[PDB]
Amino acid sequence: MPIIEQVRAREILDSRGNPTVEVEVALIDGTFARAAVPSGASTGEHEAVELRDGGDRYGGKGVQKAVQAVLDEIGPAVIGLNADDQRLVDQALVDLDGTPDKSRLGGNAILGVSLAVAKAAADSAELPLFRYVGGPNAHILPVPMMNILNGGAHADTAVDIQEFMVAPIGAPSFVEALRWGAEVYHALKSVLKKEGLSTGLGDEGGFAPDVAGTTAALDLISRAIESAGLRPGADVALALDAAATEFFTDGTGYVFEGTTRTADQMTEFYAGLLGAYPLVSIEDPLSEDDWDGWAALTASIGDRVQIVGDDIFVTNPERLEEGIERGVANALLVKVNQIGTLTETLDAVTLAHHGGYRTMISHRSGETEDTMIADLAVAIGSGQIKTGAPARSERVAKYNQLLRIEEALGDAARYAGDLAFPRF
Amino acid sequence: MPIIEQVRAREILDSRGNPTVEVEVALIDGTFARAAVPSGASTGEHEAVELRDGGDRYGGKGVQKAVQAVLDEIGPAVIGLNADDQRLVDQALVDLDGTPDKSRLGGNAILGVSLAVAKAAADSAELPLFRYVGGPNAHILPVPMMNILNGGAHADTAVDIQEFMVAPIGAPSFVEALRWGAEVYHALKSVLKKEGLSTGLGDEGGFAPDVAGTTAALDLISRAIESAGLRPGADVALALDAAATEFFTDGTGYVFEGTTRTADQMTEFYAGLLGAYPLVSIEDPLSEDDWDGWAALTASIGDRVQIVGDDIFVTNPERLEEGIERGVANALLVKVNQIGTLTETLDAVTLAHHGGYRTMISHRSGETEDTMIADLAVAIGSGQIKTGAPARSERVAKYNQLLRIEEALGDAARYAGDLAFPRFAE
Amino acid sequence: PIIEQVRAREILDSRGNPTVEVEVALIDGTFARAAVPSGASTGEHEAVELRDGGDRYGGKGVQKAVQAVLDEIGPAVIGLNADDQRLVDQALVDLDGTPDKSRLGGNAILGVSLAVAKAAADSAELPLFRYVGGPNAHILPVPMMNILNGGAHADTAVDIQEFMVAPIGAPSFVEALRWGAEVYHALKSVLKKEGLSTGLGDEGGFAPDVAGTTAALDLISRAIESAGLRPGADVALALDAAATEFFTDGTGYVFEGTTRTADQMTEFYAGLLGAYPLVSIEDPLSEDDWDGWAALTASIGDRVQIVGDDIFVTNPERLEEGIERGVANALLVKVNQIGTLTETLDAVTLAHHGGYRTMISHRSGETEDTMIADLAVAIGSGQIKTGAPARSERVAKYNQLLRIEEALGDAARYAGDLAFPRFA
Amino acid sequence: MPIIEQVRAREILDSRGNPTVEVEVALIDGTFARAAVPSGASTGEHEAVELRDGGDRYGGKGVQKAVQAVLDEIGPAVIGLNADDQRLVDQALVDLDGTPDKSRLGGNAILGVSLAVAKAAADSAELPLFRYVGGPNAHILPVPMMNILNGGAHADTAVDIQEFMVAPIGAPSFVEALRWGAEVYHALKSVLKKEGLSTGLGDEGGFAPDVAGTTAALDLISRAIESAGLRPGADVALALDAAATEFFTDGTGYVFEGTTRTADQMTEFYAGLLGAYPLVSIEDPLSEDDWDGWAALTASIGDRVQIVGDDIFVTNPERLEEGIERGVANALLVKVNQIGTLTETLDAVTLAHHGGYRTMISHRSGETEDTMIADLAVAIGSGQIKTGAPARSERVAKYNQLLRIEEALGDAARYAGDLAFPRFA
Ligand SMILES: O=C(O)[C@@H](CO)OP(=O)(O)O
Ligand SMILES: O=C(O)[C@@H](CO)OP(=O)(O)O
Ligand SMILES: O=C(O)[C@@H](CO)OP(=O)(O)O
Ligand SMILES: O=C(O)[C@@H](CO)OP(=O)(O)O
Ligand SMILES: [Cl-]
Ligand SMILES: [Mg+2]
Ligand SMILES: [Mg+2]
Ligand SMILES: [Mg+2]
Ligand SMILES: [Mg+2]
Ligand SMILES: [Mg+2]
Ligand SMILES: [Mg+2]
Ligand SMILES: [Mg+2]
Ligand SMILES: [Mg+2]
């Protein structure tokens, strides 16, 4: 009997030492589940609102008010509902908040309850979460897109691109892909040490050295792949997240690598990178609201490379719909906490999948020991996950949980590999 | 512990009184589930093989051999597997058979076990089948595409079009859609009596009068719509299944409505219908291997109407992929028994959806009391189902189950309505 | 086995008209479902079937009947023991408070009555035939199959309502079923050869517009022989004249182009007896033509079973009058003609103890409900009438008899020719 | 009963992306529990043996052999036993391996089963781990000793001391102490950015700037405390882990801040820090085997500050029994994976605890999302835990788990705060 009996939240700390919400949901059958809520640094203007305390505790980053909203309003709204009725529960939370951006109770108070209900429902059914959420057809292990050299908002350097990722598309299985990524990341550490370069980690576990720009970073990573005994392209390809909204000024343009430049100018830069490097994917090449820019870039390089919308779409169906209509991007980055409920997230995934767009399930720069996105990647069959360097366990715990999913699936497991990236 | 412990099969009768397979699967936790297998009349060349006994019993249509395959071979292969591992079970059945068209064990022996395993898994997990299969986001009640006037292979008349369907797209909910369709169906019976035409039912529960051609049939159904107090198009729209393979001869062409016609002439006929009637969907306008014809027809009218691949795709990922690459059809009919496992069926569904194609879960003309397809339609969010006139309970039991699913979902239920048919605009 | 919840809903029957479905849940978690059939050729004296009138569904909605279940019936039975069928049925009959169940509706009452019976059986972990009929329940009935349909059940001018085949010589139910299916498919091919319609009437039988009764019977005899079986010894014939439907009070029986007295109809039937292997004739005469039934029964009732349907309406009061007057020698049993399982069992008892045979019957409007299959075995009738072997509202009953036969194993007995002692 | 029915292991990755062992234990009653094994960088000579595959995969660091050893040998040797009899299980593990340093089957293979069996037993009794191991009297929340400025073996800078730690001894509860340490950690980041120093993290989530001296590091931390609105010493104190073995050369001596130094010159160093800074604890101030330096340093300054043996004792009853006899240090760092069973860990703690020595439960520089040391700190009533900066979740999950334990204890919880460091005043 999976009727919701108690809902409780607490303040815990994320992987940067900042407060976040963790929710536990208890069912009348004795089922108990826990979910934690991630937190971003390069957050788009259109993200669901995260409710912070202000005041002096934790530099203004407390979430006691989010915890109190769970105990005082959310709990009582959902107690007595069937945990299996995810859409009902998510609708109730959306209606109770009553604002479009979840500003009254906080996307952070709402999402923790939304995800803990999904987990309890799965546990009560005695199904692994990937299988509860994706049904019995769920089986595809994602290519891990590993941010091993971290810039922009995620470290304290003057490198413009936020994320330089490796993608072990050539591996035969997820267990092998994970090994290739780890061995490239360890080879990079060694290449950096041998040059003069810093091996201090950024927020997502990648190295934060201070190199001349994009191409210097890509040559360092190409060297790391070969050092690991692997082939650039055939074995391990490359991806970027520019988070270009972060180096866009309205009225001025793209303040990038020395120059102020236009959308078409940024487009020609990326196009140059595609001819010289085995790039499979480029994320947020232009800013969150540069629609005309994105439309021109997509027509120009969209056939040759995946173009992923992050801050332009914010995991938001209305925004993704406009993107699909205006021919903007060909992939959606899927961040549960940019929209605030599991239901809206799955509506965004469906809208993308049916529009011929791919999805890549994503962590935030502020993560926790929660591993739910690993199960989500498998459930939605995205074939792509972005959840950090293979270092710092808020990143590694997700990789370890994909090992467990792959092993439980046994012979039915399939690794997305090359097929995740048909344009390459 | 939803581990499979026993697998039993028996011979039951379908809704034409012919033999078919029913399978029961028991799990160690005590769960027990039963699934039955449907049978087609107008069966594509490329469907998974349906194993029949031959000989004298039941006119050669026995399925004792399929039943014996389940007890001697399939059962022992799957006992000890976890029912939750649907893909592992389905791969094991495929491999055990060892042939591309399931001809050794039969797609009928294989699918019974595939479907019973899925039902057992869902009951063990204590989730309704739509929710087990579709996960917690499943919620969309399909438009019921109701075949209210039956021709071709489903009756003994000279009507070449197999299926003349009504589609209550304008209804606010599934419960109301089902009412509109039943009301048109009862109005049609009345119009047929008035015209002195036969109200004897065909295989799928629709009237089987021997009307002169497509336009006579469409005109009798528009009258039924208006007589039920509904607006053709905006409230209740129309659809066809020509099952054109059944009137196509190789090189000769389409023997249709008293003349021989090419794929292009068939296309001009359909375009003529679209201009004159509120059609939302045409299925199998052309023959199962007329790939050149289908590509031309899709480019010609595919923007104005949905065009559904049935015998051309046979719920087969390999054939669907070709279609998508060659610009053939913009929708897939989904028939679990055309391919023979739940897994391959869901692989064909995902591939259609990701390819911009729509899907429509289908009964066969030989159905049973089994209601799995109602839950499956909700599970995949097709927004479209084809499962009979609202008459004969092997059709109506599915509608009844959709009423039960819509009730279970409470305020989260959504009816696909006219959003299932964007190309249409009364 | 305490009753905890009672819900009803409106579903559709096999002709697409609304009808009642009820669910009963017990304290122990048991949950059972039952549906109500509906006739077309309904006797004047049947329990009242409550319809909504107004526009929905051409007046044939049953929302009022559903509302009666939720408002009044459920509250009255919640807390009773589902095992106490006789106490529950008495409670239902007392709550309505009218002789013909016109206040709440026979459809609202029967649905709760059957659903209580299913729930008690599930609760005891017993198939329904065993729950109701106890350890001695074991007889598989001869399936009396209406393979050519006329009168009320199609749109032709054939006056006789049902033309049935009865596979009396089969060694088992499973073989009886195949025999009736083989003859049915042989009839279809005979009709096509003659250029006659193979469209189905309401009960799955072909509805050709044949010249009259002997034309129909000749076509069925041909079908029996075409299937390799002997008319009589293997597959016999039965009729349901539904004569109430062609009788007009004060004028007589308007039948095959002439107007006839009860006596002339008796002569017609006796003529059929001499020319064809008939084992049973139902409603040869009208529902209140008591004198006519008396004379006919004395005239031909030694040579053939004579079944009262519309004359008795499964009603102890009417049957007791028929017995006293020498009217018929068998009872057709329809749960929905009287409105409770208890009162149905009492009609059976009164018939059985009075040496009258019984034949459990569908209505022309059926559902996917299969209760009558279990009921026929539970009461030992040896005879069931539930359609041609086509249309699953008919066929689901035959499939359920296969399952019952299977579960009985070596205790199963097929009633075969012992159901028809007057024949041969 | 809680009888062991299956034991599985798998290769996972640790917080630096190197393989390590994870084990699952399933009881006949349905219970399934999971434990993971950590791995150090600055590993002592005398630690239990960490079985690595060698070869090509993972730069030689695979643990497929350790995983295989669990399936082939340890699994069958413990199935059938009662998960409640920790001592009998740990004895069967130690005897099976048969070597004193666990080199045949691997300390990593053995520990994983030892801890997964304890987690299973706890889950079967429906008890949190702290309460299962520690019994009803387990209630003390430890002071979090937070390595917020990382050097030595845990980064690539020229900083000699391995760990610069803050200790929120003045907080009224664990929940408050956690926030104090987070706030100092965040204030240090902003200080370092001011000074144009690196805020890139080392292995344990602490900043790894390349600052000049030990005093340069303590001055930056000191400013951080003050900038966080807290009082150095009274609110937040300082601790050190010098990991001296990592800069000791047998023969030539202590190579430290550009000078070879004797045992007694370093002491002179440590006692200078004691006067200028609010220090409550100095760990491994001398080398793993420098038995006389320790005895002298401990006489010299052990009255005034906690002196923690790590590499010198390696959570090993024998090595510690020695340190006590020879007046060496006054605290033991407790690493379950330096000794390889839970029983032997609890034995080494008991030796220390009866003998006057304080204990500090420790992480390894390679951690996982496992949180068992949080519960182990509380079970044994240590009052001190060393488990990283409040950043990187392989650290932070331990702190979050201490929040939940504090919650669950309710009014029974006591924060050890000031009472953990009696010599400080
Ligand atoms: O930009 C992103 O995609 C994310 C994850 O790498 O970072 P943040 O959570 O800071 O937005
Ligand atoms: O053609 C079809 O689509 C089906 C369903 O109506 O008919 P059959 O099962 O006979 O193929
Ligand atoms: O007359 C009968 O015996 C029944 C069933 O065959 O028909 P109706 O349900 O239409 O009364
Ligand atoms: O030296 C230590 O005390 C530990 C923990 O900080 O590091 P390592 O695990 O590398 O030995
Ligand atoms: Cl006819
Ligand atoms: Mg961002
Ligand atoms: Mg981004
Ligand atoms: Mg067909
Ligand atoms: Mg078709
Ligand atoms: Mg009747
Ligand atoms: Mg009758
Ligand atoms: Mg060390
Ligand atoms: Mg140390």
Author numbering:
A (entry chain B): 1 to 424
B (entry chain C): 1 to 425, 427
C (entry chain D): 2 to 425
D (entry chain A): 1 to 425
Original authors' sentences:
Enolase, a ubiquitous enzyme, catalyzes the reversible conversion of 2-phospho­glycerate (2PG) to phospho­enolpyruvate (PEP) in the glycolytic pathway of organisms of all three domains of life. Here we present structural snapshots of Mycobacterium tuberculosis (Mtb) enolase in apo, PEP-bound and two 2PG-bound forms as it catalyzes the conversion of PEP to 2PG. MtEno has a topology similar to other enolase structures, a smaller N-terminal domain and a larger C-terminal domain.
3(f) and 3(g)] have similar orientations of the bound ligand. In both of these structures, MgA 2+ coordinates with the carboxyl groups of Asp241, Glu283 and Asp310; a water molecule; and the carb­oxy­lic group of 2PG/PEP. 3(e) and 3(g)]. Hydrogen-bonding interactions with Arg364 in the highly conserved loop 4 further stabilize the associations via the phosphate moiety. Additionally, the carboxyl­ate group of 2PG/PEP interacts with both Mg2+ ions and residues Glu163, Lys386, Asp310 and Lys335 of the enzyme. Notably, 2PG in this alternate conformation has fewer hydrogen-bonding interactions in the active site due to the absence of catalytic MgB 2+. MgB 2+ plays an important role in the closing of active site loop 1 and the neutralization of the negative charge of the phosphate group in 2PG-canonical [Fig. 3(i)]. The motions of these loops are subtle in the PEP-bound state, and although the overall structure resembles to that of the apo state of MtEno, the active site loops are partially closed in the presence of PEP. The two 2PG-bound structures depict closed active site loops and more pronounced deviations in loop 2, up to 5.2 Å as in the case of Asp156 [Figs.
